[model samples]
Target: MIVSFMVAMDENRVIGKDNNLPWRLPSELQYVKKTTMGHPLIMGRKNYEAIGRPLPGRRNIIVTRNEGYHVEGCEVAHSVEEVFELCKNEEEIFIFGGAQIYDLFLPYVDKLYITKIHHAFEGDTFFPEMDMTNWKEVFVEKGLTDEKNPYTYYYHVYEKQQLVPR
Candidate 1:
C-alpha cells in the first residue's frame, strides 16, 4: 500500500492542544474527507478516542501498545509494521495522527498531504520537524486570510525522495 501522512500544523508545527485540534478550519476537515475516503487510515489510540468512533467508508486502524485494547469498529496494531500488515490488501494507506504516530511512520511515508496554517497556536502536541532536503513539493494551493478564516493556509503535497539501494 502507498503510505502517506496527513496533518494540519502551524508555523510552530503544533498539531493539537489537549487531544484536539487547536484551531477551527472546516475546510481542512473537508480536505481530509475528500482525500482519504475509502482508504485505510492508521492512527494512534488517543487520536481514535478523541474522535470517539471509526470514520465511515474507511478501514480504521488504531495503533496502541495495550494488547487488550479493542474497538468494535476499528482494527488494532501495536506498531507501524503491524498496521501495514493489516492493510496489506489495500491500495493506499493514510497515516492519520497524534504526534507520535506521525513520527513513527514518517520514515516509511511516501508522500505528505499537509495543511500549513500561517499562524501558530499554543499546543501540547506537535507534528515532527522534517528535513526539507528530503522532500520535493509536487503541489500547492494557497489560501488567504479572510472574514471567515482566521489564518492564511496552504494545502501542500510533498513527495519524499526515494533512496537507491546499492
Candidate 2:
C-alpha cells in the first residue's frame, strides 16, 4: 500500500497553532477532502479531536496511547505497527496529522500532498524538515485566491526517490 501524507504548512513549515489550523483556506480544505476521499486516513488523537468527529466517505483510524479511548464509528490503534497492520491490505493510506504522527510515519511515507501557503503565520507546531535530496516534486498547481483565501498557495505532490541497489 502507498503511504502518503496530506498536510498544509506555511513558508515557515508551521502546520498548526493551538491544535488547529493556523490559517483559513477553504479551498485547501476541499482539496484535502477530495484527495483523501475513499482512502483510509490515519491521524493522531489531537488531530481527530480538533475535527471532533469521524470524517465521512473515508475510514478513520485514530492512534493514541489511551487504551480506553474510543470514538464511535472509528477504529482506534495504540501503536504505529498496529496501524500498519490494520491497513496492510489497503491500496493507499493518508496520514492526517498534528505533528507527532507525521514524525512517526515520515520514514515510511511514499508520497506527500502538501499545500504550501506563501505567507508565514504565527504558530506553535511545525512540520519536520525533510531532506530534499531524497524527494522529487512530481506535480504542482497554483491555488485560487480571493477575499476568503487571501494568501497565495500551491498544491505540491512529491514522491520519494527510489534508491538504486548495488
Candidate 3:
C-alpha cells in the first residue's frame, strides 16, 4: 500500500488553505502523475472538488457521504472501511490526501512517498510530523528549484518499521 502527500512546508509545516494548494508547481504535478498513474488513488470528495475532475489515466476513488454525487470513471466509497473492502487483494493502492484521510490509513499503511518542497506558507491545513521513530527512509532524490519555486526539495519513500512479537 502507498500513502502519499504533496507538501509545501517551511521551517514550520503547513500544507493548504481551504482546499487549494498555496503554490503553482508543475514538476511536482508530473511527479504525482508518474507515481499514481495506474494505481487506484483514493481521496476525499473535497480533494476531487478542488481538482474538479478525476486525474487522467488513473482510477480515482473518492470517499464521501454524498449519495447523489457521481463522476464518470470514478468509484465512490462511503467510508474508509469500504475503501479496504474494495481494495482487498490488490497488490498496491494509493492513499491520496486531505489530512483526515491520511491519518485514517496511517497505521495500516506500508509506505509513504512524500514530495517535500522547501518553503512555508500561512495556511489552514498541514501535514503530520514525520515520526521517523517508526519510519525508515529507503529512498531519497533531490530536484532542481525553479522560477515559481526556489527552495530545494526531495522525494522520500519510507516504510513503517516492522514489529516483532515477543
Q: Which is the better candidate, 2 or 3, if ranked by TM-score? A: 2
Q: What is the lDDT of residue 66 in candidate 2?
A: 96
lDDT of 1 by residue, 7-37 (tens): 8899998889899887887777778898999
Model 1 scores a TM of 0.91
Per-residue lDDT of 1-166 in model 3, one digit per residue for the tens? Answer: 4445433344455667788887677777787788778778888888888999889888789988877778888999888788888887666788788777777777777787877767776678777766778878888888657895566767777877877889
**Cα-based lDDT for every prediction:** 0.87, 0.92, 0.75
Model 2, span 1-166: residue lDDT tens: 8999888999999998899987888988888899998899999999999989999999999999999999999999998899999998999999998689998898799999988999989999998888878989999999989998889999999998878999
Between prediction 2 and prediction 3, the one with superior lDDT is 2
Looking at model 1, the pairs that clash are none
Top model number, TM-score = 2
Order of models, best TM-score first: 2, 1, 3
Model 3 segments more than 4 A misplaced: 1-11, 163-166
> What TM-score number comes out for model 2?
0.95
TM-score of 3: 0.87
With candidate 1 superimposed using the best TM-score fit, by how many Å does residue 166's alpha carbon deviate from the native? 14
Q: Model 3 lDDT vs. the true structure?
A: 0.75
**Model 1 misses residue 115 by how many Å?**
0.5
